[PDB]
Amino acid sequence: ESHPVLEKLKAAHSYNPKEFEWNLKSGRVFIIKSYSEDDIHRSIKYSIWCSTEHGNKRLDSAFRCMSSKGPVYLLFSVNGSGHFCGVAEMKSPVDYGKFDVQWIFVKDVPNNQLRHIRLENNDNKPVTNSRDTQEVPLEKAKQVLKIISSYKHTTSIFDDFAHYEKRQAVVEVVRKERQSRNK
């Protein structure tokens, strides 16, 4: 049994494209650390993301600087998870906060596949030990994207899609009822 929201998304978008250009001619690449799976699920279904105030300012500045001269890619991981869960392209500046994204890869890549890549601009720490909106230098970003694109993943957040749908629905009714008790 597959969920109609997920079937619509898969039919409208070409997730995990088998031809993806990891050897970028230009572009900038950033880490996104999400607070929960629920935020990832919402972002995939609505093509939207929101960082902190400072994170939003950093990403806004990077997107405007790129001036349509190359892509801004975002590599997503939930705090404490032990894997990356996907890759989206930033598609608009920040609107005050939120900005448009286009999800491209939706797949789990364990950290042990990526920890050998270290970021010279962050004390040579592994890319898997990054904070939200940490920037990845272009050549290391190429190696990360090559690994993510190629990885033969066994699972992804889509495998729990119906679960996240039901969670969202129940949260809404609970909040509405709570407001109802407060008027």
UniProtKB/Swiss-Prot annotation:
Residue stretches in coiled coil: none
Assigned GO CC terms: cytoplasm; cytoplasmic stress granule; P-body
Chief location of this protein within or outside the cell: cytoplasm
Binding-site list for RNA: K33, S34, Y35, D39, W49, C50, N79
GO MF annotation: an example: mRNA binding
Subcellular location: Cytoplasm; Cytoplasm, P-body; Cytoplasm, Stress granule
Sorted UniProt keywords: Acetylation, Cytoplasm, Immunity, Phosphoprotein, RNA-binding, Ubl conjugation
Domain YTH: 27-148
Domain of life according to the entry: Eukaryota
Processing after translation: Ubiquitinated by the CUL7-FBXW8 E3 ligase complex leading to degradation. Deubiquitinated and stabilized by USP5 by removing 'Lys-11'-linked polyubiquitination.
Keyword Translocase: no
Disulfide bonds: none
GO BP: immune system process; learning; memory; mRNA destabilization; organelle assembly; positive regulation of translation; positive regulation of translational initiation; regulation of antigen processing and presentation
Family (UniProt): Belongs to the YTHDF family. YTHDF1 subfamily.
Role, per record: Specifically recognizes and binds N6-methyladenosine (m6A)-containing mRNAs, and regulates their stability. M6A is a modification present at internal sites of mRNAs and some non-coding RNAs and plays a role in mRNA stability and processing. Acts as a regulator of mRNA stability by promoting degradation of m6A-containing mRNAs via interaction with the CCR4-NOT complex. The YTHDF paralogs (YTHDF1, YTHDF2 and YTHDF3) shares m6A-containing mRNAs targets and act redundantly to mediate mRNA degradation and cellular differentiation.
Domain comment as written in the entry: The disordered regions have the ability to interact with each other and to 'phase separate' into liquid droplets within the cytosol following binding to mRNAs containing multiple m6A-modified residues. This leads to the partition of m6A-containing mRNAs into membraneless compartments, where mRNAs may be stored, degraded or used to transport mRNAs to dendritic arbors in neurons.
Assembly, per entry: Interacts with CNOT1; promoting recruitment of the CCR4-NOT complex. Interacts with ribosomes. Interacts with eIF3 (EIF3A or EIF3B). Interacts with YTHDF3.
Protein name per the record: YTH domain-containing family protein 1
The organism's taxonomic lineage, starting at the top: Eukaryota, Metazoa, Chordata, Craniata, Vertebrata
